[PDB]
C-alpha cells in the first residue's frame, strides 16, 4: 500500500489474512495473549512480539518504507513461533505452512 513493491507486500498480507489460509493462519491474526493462553514465560523468551494485525496496522499507517522492512516483521512473527515452541508443536507446523505461502509469493516481488 504505497510504492509498487509495497503494493505487492499489501497483496501478500491480504492473502495471509484470507479464508484460503485460515486453517493455519489463525494463530498469527492477533498478538499472542500470553496470560490468556497460560504462557507466563512468553515475554521473557520473545523480546519483540509480532502478528498480522500489527503488520496490517503498520501498512495502513505507512510505517513500512520498503518491502524489506515489511518482510522483516513477517519473518520476526514466524521466528518468534520457532523460538518459543517445541518444533513438533501444531502451531509450528501451521507457521511453516503460512511461511511457505509468504516466501514463495514474496519471491515474486516486481523489480
Ligand atoms: C510451548 C507451548 N506452547 C503453547 O502452549 C501454545 C499454545 C497455543 C498457541 O497458540 C494457539 C494455538 C495454536 C495452534 C493450535 C492451537 N492453539 C501457541 C502459540 C501461538 N503462537 C503465535 N505461538 N505460539 C502456543
UniProtKB/Swiss-Prot annotation:
Annotated compartments: Nucleus; Chromosome
Outcome, altering residue 85 to A: Abolished binding to histone H4 acetylated at 'Lys-12' (H4K12ac)
Top-level taxon in the UniProt lineage: Eukaryota
Domain Bromo: 1-109
Note: Some specific inhibitors of BRD2 that prevent binding to acetylated histone are promising therapeutic molecules for the treatment of cancers or inflammatory diseases. ABBV-744, a small molecule, has been tested on tumors with success: ABBV-744 antiproliferative activity is mainly restricted to cell lines of acute myeloid leukaemia and prostate cancer and is able to displace BRD4 from chromatin. GSK046 (iBET-BD2), which specifically inhibits the second bromo domain, is a promising therapeutic small molecule for the treatment of inflammatory and autoimmune diseases.
Complex formation: Homodimer. Interacts with E2F1. Interacts with (acetylated) STAT3; promoting STAT3 recruitment to chromatin. Interacts with CTCF; promoting BRD2 recruitment to chromatin.
Protein family membership: Belongs to the BET family.
Function of the molecule: Chromatin reader protein that specifically recognizes and binds histone H4 acetylated at 'Lys-5' and 'Lys-12' (H4K5ac and H4K12ac, respectively), thereby controlling gene expression and remodeling chromatin structures. Recruits transcription factors and coactivators to target gene sites, and activates RNA polymerase II machinery for transcriptional elongation.
Record remark on domains: The first bromo domain specifically recognizes histone H4 acetylated at 'Lys-12' (H4K12ac). It also specifically binds histone H4 acetyl-methylated at 'Lys-5' and 'Lys-12' (H4K5acme and H4K12acme, respectively). The second bromo domain recognizes and binds histone H4 acetylated at 'Lys-5' and 'Lys-12' (H4K5ac and H4K12ac, respectively).
Protein name, UniProt field: Bromodomain-containing protein 2
Organism: Homo sapiens (Human)
Source taxonomy: Eukaryota, Metazoa, Chordata, Craniata, Vertebrata
Part of the full-length chain shown: 345 to 455 of 801
Amino acid at each position: 500500500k504505497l510504492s509498487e513493491q509495497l503494493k505487492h507486500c499489501n497483496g501478500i498480507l491480504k492473502e495471509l489474512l484470507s479464508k484460503k489460509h485460515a486453517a493455519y493462519a489463525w494463530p498469527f491474526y492477533k498478538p499472542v495473549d500470553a496470560s490468556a493462553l497460560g504462557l507466563h514465560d512468553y515475554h521473557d523468551i520473545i523480546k519483540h512480539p509480532m502478528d498480522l494485525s500489527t503488520v496490517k496496522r503498520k501498512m495502513e499507517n505507512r510505517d513500512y518504507r520498503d518491502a524489506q522492512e515489511f518482510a522483516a516483521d513477517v519473518r520476526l512473527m514466524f521466528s518468534n513461533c520457532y523460538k518459543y515452541n517445541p518444533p513438533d508443536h501444531d502451531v509450528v507446523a501451521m507457521a511453516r505452512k503460512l511461511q511457505d505461502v509468504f516466501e514463495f509469493r514474496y519471491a515474486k516481488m516486481p523489480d
